Amino acid sequence: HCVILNDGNFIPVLGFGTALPLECPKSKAKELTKIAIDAGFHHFDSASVYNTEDHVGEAIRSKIADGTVRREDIFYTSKVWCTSLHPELVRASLERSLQKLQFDYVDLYLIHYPMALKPGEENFPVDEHGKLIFDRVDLCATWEAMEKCKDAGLTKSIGVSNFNYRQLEMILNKPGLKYKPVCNQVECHPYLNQMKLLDFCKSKDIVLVAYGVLGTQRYGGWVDQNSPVLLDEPVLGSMAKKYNRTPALIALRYQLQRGIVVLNTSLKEERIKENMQVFEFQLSSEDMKVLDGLNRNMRYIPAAIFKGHPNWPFLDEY
Numbered sequence: 001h002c003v004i005l006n007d008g009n010f011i012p013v014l015g016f017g018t019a020l021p022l023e024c025p026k027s028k029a030k031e032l033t034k035i036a037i038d039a040g041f042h043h044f045d046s047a048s049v050y051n052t053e054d055h056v057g058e059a060i061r062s063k064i065a066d067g068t069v070r071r072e073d074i075f076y077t078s079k080v081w082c083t084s085l086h087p088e089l090v091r092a093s094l095e096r097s098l099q100k101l102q103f104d105y106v107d108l109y110l111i112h113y114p115m116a117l118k119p120g121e122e123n124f125p126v127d128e129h130g131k132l133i134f135d136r137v138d139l140c141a142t143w144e145a146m147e148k149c150k151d152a153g154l155t156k157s158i159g160v161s162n163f164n165y166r167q168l169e170m171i172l173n174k175p176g177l178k179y180k181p182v183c184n185q186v187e188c189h190p191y192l193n194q195m196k197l198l199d200f201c202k203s204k205d206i207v208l209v210a211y212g213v214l215g216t217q218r219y220g221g222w223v224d225q226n227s228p229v230l231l232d233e234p235v236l237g238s239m240a241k242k243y244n245r246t247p248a249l250i251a252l253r254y255q256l257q258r259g260i261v262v263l264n265t266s267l268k269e270e271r272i273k274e275n276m277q278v279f280e281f282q283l284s285s286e287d288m289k290v291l292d293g294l295n296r297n298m299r300y301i302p303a304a305i306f307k308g309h310p311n312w313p314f315l316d317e318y
């Protein structure tokens with residue numbers, strides 16, 4: 001179950017996300033990755049800022065070493081963080097991730113956010129008022145650095161995350177552009193269906209990879225705890241009953257039928273296994289329209305601490 005990227009490489013349409021809630025120890029990522037591999041997942045999504053690439057890498061290497069899977073059958077994604085967007089720092093960050101993973105290459109490397117922060121070891125540099133210290137970077141130069149990483153064989157494909165249409169255009173219209181982003185990883189679910197951005201990405205052969213498909217893990221410090229819980233949506237419950245599935249399976253299938261590559265995370269083995277059942281049924285065209293009607297511009301992860309940044313991506317309509 002894969003789709004072909006604009007650079008010729010293949011990506012599994014269902015991926016397991018390795019980000020964790022604030023209360024979980026980093027080692028949890030190793031445990032879950034092993035469970036996900038046993039459940040049939042081949043696509044794993046990580047990021048340098050998660051600081052658990054070492055744990056995910058150990059899980060994958062353990063399953064390769066014991067005969068469960070081969071490296072070529074695993075699709076691993078990492079992302080360069082805001083503090084390393086400067087052109088001269090991009091490759092250094094990827095090389096650091098490769099060392100943590102003890103991998104020769106990653107399958108996909110993304111710009112995590114189109115917003116640079118003061119360079120340094122600290123991922124969230126702040127001033128004396130507790131405000132993030134923004135930095136200005138030539139994102140087209142950042143992209144050129146990403147292209148060099150691909151040409152150096154450190155990553156098979158390159159893309160972006162949390163970019164809006166104008167930011168994608170900046171790259172697409174860049175003079176000397178060699179590789180278009182293969183994807184734009186953004187938040188997407190029935191309450192924020194990204195109809196406009198999805199249409200734009202499709203017209204440019206850019207795959208939309210979705211997170212928050214099940215409403216996000218509601219991370220403390222990022223998600224408003226008073227926001228509605230997506231899977232509690234009555235329409236998803238009614239549809240789950242109709243198709244004899246679960247609200248989560250309905251939400252996952254909705255996105256797959258829109259041509260979206262979906263990420264998902266669960267701390268429970270039973271659910272990790274259940275989610276693989278999304279390939280077993282089809283939502284009718286009429287029911288897809290019912291789910292299209294739930295849009296309400298509910299953005300669970302607005303990256304609020306970045307508000308004020310000249311490149312905050314969520315101000316524009318899309």
Ligand SMILES: NC(=O)C1=CN([C@@H]2O[C@H](COP(=O)(O)OP(=O)(O)OC[C@H]3O[C@@H](n4cnc5c(N)ncnc54)[C@H](OP(=O)(O)O)[C@@H]3O)[C@@H](O)[C@H]2O)C=CC1
Pocket residue numbers: 016017018019020045046112161162185186210211212213214215216217218231246248249263264265266267268271272274275301
């Ligand atoms: N690029 C970016 O900016 C970001 C990327 N991500 C990526 O997206 C991945 C997915 O995470 P996220 O979007 O937060 O979360 P999801 O929307 O994928 O999941 C939200 C919740 O769904 C629950 N859930 C999962 N499966 C089931 C099921 N079968 N039945 C009932 N409940 C279920 C989980 O709860 P429980 O664990 O209790 O089962 C989980 O807390 C991350 O790990 C990361 O890789 C995340 C945030 C930002």
